[PDB]
Amino acid sequence: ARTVVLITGCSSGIGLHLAVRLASDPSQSFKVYATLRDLKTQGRLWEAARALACPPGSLETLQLDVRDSKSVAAARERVTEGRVDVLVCNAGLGLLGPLEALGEDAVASVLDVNVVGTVRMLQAFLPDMKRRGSGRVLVTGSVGGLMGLPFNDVYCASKFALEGLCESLAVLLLPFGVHLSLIECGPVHTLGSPEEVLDRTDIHTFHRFYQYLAHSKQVFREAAQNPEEVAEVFLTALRAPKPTLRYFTTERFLPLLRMRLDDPSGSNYVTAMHREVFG
Amino acid sequence: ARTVVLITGCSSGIGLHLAVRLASDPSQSFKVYATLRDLKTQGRLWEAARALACPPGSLETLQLDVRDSKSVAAARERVTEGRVDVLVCNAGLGLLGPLEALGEDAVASVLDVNVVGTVRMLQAFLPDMKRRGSGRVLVTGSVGGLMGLPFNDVYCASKFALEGLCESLAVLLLPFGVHLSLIECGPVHTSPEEVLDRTDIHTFHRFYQYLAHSKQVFREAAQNPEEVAEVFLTALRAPKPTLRYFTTERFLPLLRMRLDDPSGSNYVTAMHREVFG
């Protein structure tokens, strides 16, 4: 019988493309529960599943809101096979702006979804994998969790939080046979404001922001991968017999992660990334 | 022009010790606002300050609960000089255990106090430093924010979060004249029915292995809050301060081993045997 996969954040992007890539795999070894915050966004998913000709019963949708442990629980109970072989923690919010303009609730929500939500997922599904002696957990990580970037203060916070969360658990899970990996993504082919911003921020920050934005759209256009490409990395990690804690989707940033970790006082990275972003 | 300093989490430990040290400084160069979750708890602080004859008016206490933006803003406007030269984000909570055994609320508390709490402070105090073109922010970091350790999953997630938040602001903040630094601490001096039900027997084992191993590292490695406090003073008076300062070099090897292997497999192997016999 098949490898049972459950994936959070499947309405679009990586989650959507991974779920159908797995459910449509010519091996037909995967049963996929693609989970979604709101079942009303499932159109694109079911369209793509139908384009790739996913066999009947390879793909099912569940509603799963990672802010709500009872929603988490109810989705787990809906896994008829009664176990999960592969958990993919992929749901995540973005947030982009000068720290002082971001609404307090929005800061809270990014943490609650990206970090607390990933904790809830692991709390709900890890016990069974431990008791069993097997399971793959994959977490959609980020380059913004390895290095900080201006105006991504809270997004970066949350992705660094995943590093810490996962690295700690991975040290516990060795003699269990459960393999937690992070899939470190760079930019990908799939948040700001105006008078809201400037009122709260200051006249010089206001302009340093769009010098970041209009710079970012450059790096978008030279390394923003396909989610198919990314999905495919999640696959290599599943089929890995001894998977590592991190996998990288693109190499275009391993220069800086060399430079960053040369200086343990860290002010080399600060200087170099400031020049590289602005001038 | 005295240096105005505002510090969170001053009822005890690092925050208390830094507060009295700056207020007693022979120069009387510093005016200290030492803040507390609850003011009723300020007894020990003033006793410590009285011990070093901190002159009158060199130390003020305030209530500041970092979970509440109004507490943060009210505390800010009690700063009679109308500015802060040095902001110390030191308030923090701990949480230790197997992930599946920790309460959901406890998990959200740690993130809210440790991460969002620090974001609130920065939201309330940074803009003033930006328009003025000057200011220092010191944040109490941890080696647990540089490397993950078993049963410290949520604690580490929060200290890692601090690293990303601060490193991201630091890149924005060079040209404004505002220096942010993390003071990276190691350990610092100051039930199995309920465990077992919420966790397999396998993990119940490891947790107590870890607990015995932690005891030892604490006996060997722990620092006085006063030694830590002195590193904050170095950062304060560094003419161009760096993003991190370490209160110990003890764990820098383990940290480099982790920096050697970006795939992270080496770190985990090493720390697993190192921790579990």
Curated annotation (Swiss-Prot), chain A:
Pathway: Steroid biosynthesis; estrogen biosynthesis. The modification Phosphoserine is found at S134. One of its GO terms (molecular function) is 17-beta-hydroxysteroid dehydrogenase (NADP+) activity. InterPro entries: 17beta_DH, NAD(P)-bd_dom_sf, Sc_DH/Rdtase_CS, SDR_fam. Its EC number is 1.1.1.51, 1.1.1.62. The active site is at Y155 (proton acceptor). Keywords: Cytoplasm, Lipid biosynthesis, Lipid metabolism, NADP, Oxidoreductase, Phosphoprotein, Steroid biosynthesis. NADP(+) binds at residues 9-37, 65, 159. GO terms for biological process: adipose tissue development; bone development; cellular response to metal ion; estrogen biosynthetic process; estrogen metabolic process; gene expression; lysosome organization; skeletal muscle tissue development. It holds the Pfam family adh_short. It catalyses: 17beta-estradiol + NAD(+) = estrone + NADH + H(+); 17beta-estradiol + NADP(+) = estrone + NADPH + H(+); testosterone + NADP(+) = androst-4-ene-3,17-dione + NADPH + H(+). Its main location: cytoplasm. One of its GO terms (cellular component) is cytosol. It is found in: Cytoplasm. Changing H215A: No effect on conversion of estrone to 17beta-estradiol. Homodimer. Exists predominantly as a homodimer but also exits as monomer. Favors the reduction of estrogens and androgens. Converts estrone (E1) to a more potent estrogen, 17beta-estradiol (E2). Also has 20-alpha-HSD activity. Uses preferentially NADH. Belongs to the short-chain dehydrogenases/reductases (SDR) family. This is 17-beta-hydroxysteroid dehydrogenase type 1. It comes from Homo sapiens.
Curated annotation (Swiss-Prot), chain B:
The modification Phosphoserine is found at S134. Changing E274Q: No effect on conversion of estrone to 17beta-estradiol. Its EC number is 1.1.1.51, 1.1.1.62. The keyword Transferase does not apply. The keyword tRNA processing does not apply. One of its GO terms (molecular function) is NADP binding. Its main location: cytoplasm. It is found in: Cytoplasm. The active site is at Y155. Pfam families: adh_short. It is an enzyme of class 1 (oxidoreductase). It catalyses: 17beta-estradiol + NAD(+) = estrone + NADH + H(+); 17beta-estradiol + NADP(+) = estrone + NADPH + H(+); testosterone + NADP(+) = androst-4-ene-3,17-dione + NADPH + H(+). GO terms for biological process: adipose tissue development; bone development; cellular response to metal ion; estrogen biosynthetic process; estrogen metabolic process; gene expression; lysosome organization; skeletal muscle tissue development. Changing S142A: Loss of 17-beta-hydroxysteroid dehydrogenase activity. Coiled coil: none annotated. Changing L149V: Alters substrate specificity. SUPFAM superfamilies: NAD(P)-binding Rossmann-fold domains. Transmembrane segments: none annotated. Homodimer. Exists predominantly as a homodimer but also exits as monomer. This is 17-beta-hydroxysteroid dehydrogenase type 1. It comes from Homo sapiens (Human).
